[PDB]
Design a binder for these strands. Sequence first.
DNA 1: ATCAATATCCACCTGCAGATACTACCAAAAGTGTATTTGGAAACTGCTCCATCAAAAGGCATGTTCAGCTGAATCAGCTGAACATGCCTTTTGATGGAGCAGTTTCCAAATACACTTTTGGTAGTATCTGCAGGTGGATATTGAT
DNA 2: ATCAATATCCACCTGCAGATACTACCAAAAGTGTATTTGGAAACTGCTCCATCAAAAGGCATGTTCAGCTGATTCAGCTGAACATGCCTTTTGATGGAGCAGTTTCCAAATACACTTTTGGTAGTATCTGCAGGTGGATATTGAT
Lengths: 97, 97, 106, 106, 87, 82, 95, 95
Amino acid sequence: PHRYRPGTVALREIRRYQKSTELLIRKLPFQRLVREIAQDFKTDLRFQSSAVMALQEASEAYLVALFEDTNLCAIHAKRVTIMPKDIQLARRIRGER
Amino acid sequence: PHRYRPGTVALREIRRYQKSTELLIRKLPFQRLVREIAQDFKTDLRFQSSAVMALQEASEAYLVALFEDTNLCAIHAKRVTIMPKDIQLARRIRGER
Amino acid sequence: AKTRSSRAGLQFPVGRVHRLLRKGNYAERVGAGAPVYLAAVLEYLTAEILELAGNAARDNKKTRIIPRHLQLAVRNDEELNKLLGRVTIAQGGVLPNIQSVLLPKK
Amino acid sequence: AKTRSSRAGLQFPVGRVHRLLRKGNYAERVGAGAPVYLAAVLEYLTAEILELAGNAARDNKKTRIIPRHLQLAVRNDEELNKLLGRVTIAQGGVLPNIQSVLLPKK
Amino acid sequence: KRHRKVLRDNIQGITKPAIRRLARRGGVKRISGLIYEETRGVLKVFLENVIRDAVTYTEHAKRKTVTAMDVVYALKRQGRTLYGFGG
Amino acid sequence: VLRDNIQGITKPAIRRLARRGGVKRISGLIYEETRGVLKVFLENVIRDAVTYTEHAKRKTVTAMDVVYALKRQGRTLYGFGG
Amino acid sequence: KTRKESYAIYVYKVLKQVHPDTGISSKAMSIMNSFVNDVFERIAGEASRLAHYNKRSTITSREIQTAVRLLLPGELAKHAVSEGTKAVTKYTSAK
Amino acid sequence: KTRKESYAIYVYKVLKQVHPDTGISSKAMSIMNSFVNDVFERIAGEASRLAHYNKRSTITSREIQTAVRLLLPGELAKHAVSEGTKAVTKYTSAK
DNA sequence: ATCAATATCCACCTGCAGATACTACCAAAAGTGTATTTGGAAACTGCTCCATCAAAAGGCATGTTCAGCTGAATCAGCTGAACATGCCTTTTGATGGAGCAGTTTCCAAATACACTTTTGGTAGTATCTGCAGGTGGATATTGAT
DNA sequence: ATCAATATCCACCTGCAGATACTACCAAAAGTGTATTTGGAAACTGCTCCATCAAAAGGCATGTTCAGCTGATTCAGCTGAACATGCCTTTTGATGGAGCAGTTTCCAAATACACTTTTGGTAGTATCTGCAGGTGGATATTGAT
Ligand SMILES: C1N2CN3CN1CP(C2)C3
Ligand SMILES: C1N2CN3CN1CP(C2)C3
Ligand SMILES: C1N2CN3CN1CP(C2)C3
Ligand SMILES: Cc1ccc(C(C)C)cc1
Ligand SMILES: Cc1ccc(C(C)C)cc1
Ligand SMILES: Cc1ccc(C(C)C)cc1
Ligand SMILES: [Mg+2]
Ligand SMILES: [Ru+3]
Ligand SMILES: [Ru+3]
Ligand SMILES: [Ru+3]
């Protein structure tokens, strides 16, 4: 019977993910979400497959950068745990509101 | 023998200053600082009167707004006192760092 | 002779807007309605701000619109504020606003 | 029978750059030196990035520059990082970077 | 074409583990349980803004297909320029 | 009484600006921090404005030179031309 | 000496329709002028971009309309669009 | 089968100059191509505005030069200015 | 420290994806040359409006005092990490057509050029007034007790 | 609570900075009539690649467990707020002169047009090679003890 202490695998994963460049969201799920949002704007649309890839690259880079900012807001508050209020602080300072 | 509590005059000023629109830095000090900085870029420079005003309008608006974000950063960390780290967090998230 | 503004029922100069588009290197050519449309849009938006700035003047017991009235107008309207979100109105000040945690205890 | 590129001592294409300037409607007229000067700046910047990207490839024991190397290049260089501060390199990932307080012990 | 499957609740294909990964790449060590819904919300806003603009370019061109280029131009408008897809 | 120009941006004036920004309590170290931030702001904008001046073969920084510098730095200002 | 143009009088004409008893300071007028110029540039700029993306030599009201949608927030866009289409209709029918 | 142009071969020539044994993936090339287009448009844009602000109908190497100083940060600007000046001087004398 | 469970780091290999190659060709380029148009530097100069400075105004540098904030220490409760476990969903590879995108004809529309009419910026002189800044006194707020 | 120091409120008055009003004016746009050039919808159709179906690769969902994080409580001590005004820096206003801006000039350089050549792209069919993803095998890291 064996166990890593909480935080050990987490750090392992940080090093792993910061090392690679592959998209971290599953392709089909992400694609359904795009098609749904678009359909709500306009019916009977097609997407070139690189259009979807573009969005996905853009969305993952947006979300990763937002998490670094969020992480900095948590750390500022003397925590190591990101919370919805950290994200909200980031987005307000970023002028997304 | 009458003394206002810490923060009373602080609140009073916030209301006063959030109501007016005058520039809150003295014109002369600001003008010298402008010319000084400009000197490192080109010598023998003159400035229109409205050029210096434009610069003052912009620098105060910038600084006023940054104190808003900074104030949010202090509050996030459960304080009511702005510190250099709060300005630093604000500038970092704004992507000025 | 009758101005293209009056033809289109507009206070905003269709002629000038037409010219400014040409000598702006926006495109090789400029259709006949584009200045009309563009000028209407500008008249529209002007009126919107002028109305709300007027109202702001009223509130503060004034008949002369000043920058402060334009600032209160723009930042108290969600849509105008978003359009001018990276814009500074000279001599506008800010909206009275104090974070509640900073208020003294009842 | 000489190209303007060889005349200026450039790999980048002055003719092309001249053509692209005209059709982009940046101004009525385009001076003869403009495409020359611009093609050189472009060449300079692309040499700068390829140098640095080449090194990142080499540091990874790779012979072929891929988007991760371009990202290492740009983000590790203060000036290219700023010039491209609002740009995203598809398939570039991020810089390894873990905040101190996050590490084990004391 | 006969029949055209209903799309609903797809926001949920953005799973807990996928969001954890993005946090990791972003250097996050510990993640409160509420982050996941908040992230879905934020992602959805980001996507609407870019899709709206993208679809607008598509319609202006009188097309039915959203191009890589429609997206790239929408990304540029919003100050999130993308390299890798023709722009 | 020899003194840097940056120091002409005094404690009380920085305190006023903070106040308009809704700030109640202010750490002592803020004042030097703020001056730093202000100097970087002016450098960036002035650098760009002067560059417009030099281009126009003038020796006078015009309001328009400043207004254009502000626009490109993402800080559009209204009320001084253009 | 050289004539310095301005939207100042048209802004002033519109002021009167909207608030016939209300005046405007110089500084406020100058702001209003910046506003029109700024929005002018944002709209023309986007329109130029559109025409280029679609290999067209002309900026038509279609380009201005799409420009307006892209640039204006929701409700401001819709009205602006309706004021624009309105002005073109009226303009055409008029001899 | 319309001809789609790119800076690919020029990027490749320059790549050979600096790293003679190094290759580039097509994706990396795509990004290189986007980067040149990006910088091109940004310098052309600044040059455009600049000319207009100065009531000029011509974009000359002087306009490009100022656009470079406005657009690029410190050391990249200094060096880019050298290279472009060098190319123009050499271009002028080469006929 | 000692032991050991598990991740990590090499090294070496091998199919094959995707990259470099090459031979044919060509349309759209870029180049060359000669003719005609003009933008903008260049030079003189007139009048703002900018630097400078004396006198008049008034905001701030000073140090002392202590309220109340920040941050360290301590702790219980409980959230969120780790991991085992069962299996559903995505990924990968191979077959039909909507629509994109490339060619051409043709007029509806924008350019151009010159002409003739008015509008809008300035300046001139004067013409007018909304309100910032001051008074007075009534009432609210804050803080001591 | 009460009491009093001071801030805040409203009303009314007043001089003038800064607003609207005005006519000449003339010059420069904007609009009107004639001839020219050009763009892009519509009609048509090759053909890329998008949507939509079945089989294989592995990531997701869920429950359990307890480590350690968060956030409450308390508290000592440090640090920033408030305070009074003579004192020194900024503001207001007075006046030469730099330079910016208006104007005219003329030519080097740019546009235009018309053969003439070169080249950058693709396409067809081939040919090479970096490295991703598999294996096993040797060394670090981690956590119990
Ligand atoms: C119509 N439009 C223009 N103005 C008058 N009314 C009401 P709003 C919009 C201001
Ligand atoms: C929040 N709400 C309003 N709009 C923006 N975001 C996402 P949806 C719901 C459209
Ligand atoms: C709010 N409502 C009334 N008017 C102004 N705005 C936008 P629409 C609906 C017209
Ligand atoms: C909440 C919600 C969900 C979808 C949309 C789309 C139509 C933009 C808007 C709000
Ligand atoms: C059409 C309209 C009418 C009033 C307003 C303001 C008063 C909010 C805006 C648009
Ligand atoms: C976009 C919109 C919203 C509301 C109205 C009102 C006048 C019904 C109109 C347009
Ligand atoms: Mg739907
Ligand atoms: Ru309205
Ligand atoms: Ru929604
Ligand atoms: Ru409406």
